[PDB]
């Protein structure tokens, strides 16, 4: 099914799978402050993670995998997906991170939490990189889907596992075909298509680097829950 989609049908399915932009809580009895900042950001990420589950299930080829492999892929990629969504939202807001439309934070508000501004600056630089590249929404949904399928594919031996890995790489190839088709459709020459494809995928290495640094920072302050939403019934 997923391997027979055209590039336009793959763009359409990814654009349609896009989750909504969530808001920070409008609690007057909890106004924004340095103390309540991480509580608001954690609550926002928790609500985003629920929508990330539905988005993943709508990425073509994802539900063809076993849920154990669906859980592992999302366990490996969830923070990367949150960050690239943040970086995408903040593209039009230089020097600031748009966590939510009602939660636009500048660099100085990150200094209140120790260790935050280092991750803050890396997210800002990625947003500047996307801005300088004029990243398109059709390219963004492809990059996010690549992260979902690639981040955990090297950390799964059984015959089933060999079929799953081959399928993940077959779907990743079709996203690559989709990215190139979007670049050819935009007028880029073949040399420019390969060059921009390389530039976009090399940004994924930095997003992984930010994720690892973000995991150490967050731990300095999921599997069962990921399963519970992914292991839905048909009632």
Ligand X SMILES: N[C@@H](Cc1c[nH]c[nH+]1)C(=O)O
Ligand Y SMILES: O=C(c1ccccc1)N1[C@H](c2ccc(OC[C@@H]3CCN(CCCF)C3)cc2)c2ccc(O)cc2CC12CC2
Ligand Z SMILES: O=C(c1ccccc1)N1[C@H](c2ccc(OC[C@H]3C=CN(CCCF)C3)cc2)c2ccc(O)cc2CC12CC2
Nearer CB in complex with ligand Z: 61/214: 214
In whole angstroms, give the CA distance from residue 183 to residue 192.
Answer: 8
Nearer CB in complex with ligand Z: 79/168: 79
Q: Is 129 annotated as a binding residue?
A: no
- DSSP label at residue 92: G
Q: Does 51 bind a second copy (CB under 8 A)?
A: no
Query: Rg of the chain's alpha carbons, rounded to an integer?
Result: 18
Q: Find the binding residues for ligand Y in span 19-78 (CB under 6 A).
A: 41-42, 44-46, 48-49
Q: Is 89 annotated as a binding residue?
A: yes
- Per the CB < 8 A criterion, the answer to whether 145 and 7 are in contact is no
Number of H helices, E strands in the chain: 9, 2
Q: Considering only the stretches 11-19, 45-53, 165-173, 226-234, report the one whose residues sit in contact with a second copy under the rule CB under 8 A.
A: 165-173
Q: Which of 17, 52, 116, 179 binds ligand Z (CB under 6 A)?
A: 116
Residue 5 contact partner, candidates a second copy, ligand Y, ligand Z, none, CB within 5 to 8 A by sort of partner? none
Q: Which of 49, 148, 168, 197 binds ligand Z (CB under 6 A)?
A: 49
Q: Does 225 bind ligand Y (CB under 6 A)?
A: yes
Q: How distant, in Å, are the alpha carbons of 64, 78, 82, 233 from that of 210?
A: 29, 12, 11, 35
- Per the CB < 8 A criterion, the answer to whether 75 and 202 are in contact is no
In whole angstroms, give the CA distance from residue 73 to residue 144.
Answer: 13
**Interface mask toward a second copy for 197-216; x: CB under 8 A:** xxx-xxxxxxxxx--xx--x
């Amino acid at each position: 099914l997923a391997l027979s989609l055209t590039a336009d049908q793959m763009v359409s399915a990814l654009l349609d799978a896009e989750p909504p932009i969530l808001y920070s809580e409008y609690d007057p009895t909890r106004p924004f402050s340095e103390a309540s900042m991480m509580g608001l950001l954690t609550n926002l990420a928790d609500r985003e993670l629920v929508h990330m589950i539905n988005w993943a299930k709508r990425v073509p080829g994802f539900v063809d995998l076993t849920l154990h492999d669906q859980v592992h892929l999302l366990e490996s990629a969830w923070l990367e997906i949150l960050m690239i969504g943040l970086v995408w939202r903040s593209m039009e807001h230089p020097g600031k991170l748009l966590f939510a439309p009602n939660l636009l934070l500048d660099r100085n508000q990150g200094k209140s939490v120790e260790g935050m501004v280092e991750i803050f600056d890396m997210l800002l630089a990625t947003s500047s990189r996307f801005r300088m590249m004029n990243l398109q929404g059709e390219e963004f949904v492809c990059l996010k889907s690549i992260i979902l399928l690639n981040s955990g594919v090297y950390t799964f031996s059984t015959l089933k596992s060999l079929e799953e890995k081959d399928h993940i790489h077959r779907v990743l190839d079709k996203i690559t075909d989709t990215l190139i088709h979007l670049m050819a459709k935009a007028g880029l020459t073949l040399q420019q298509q390969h060059q921009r494809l390389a530039q976009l995928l090399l940004i994924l290495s930095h997003i992984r680097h930010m994720s690892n640094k973000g995991m150490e920072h967050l731990y300095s302050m999921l599997s069962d829950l990921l399963l519970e939403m992914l292991d839905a019934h048909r009632l």
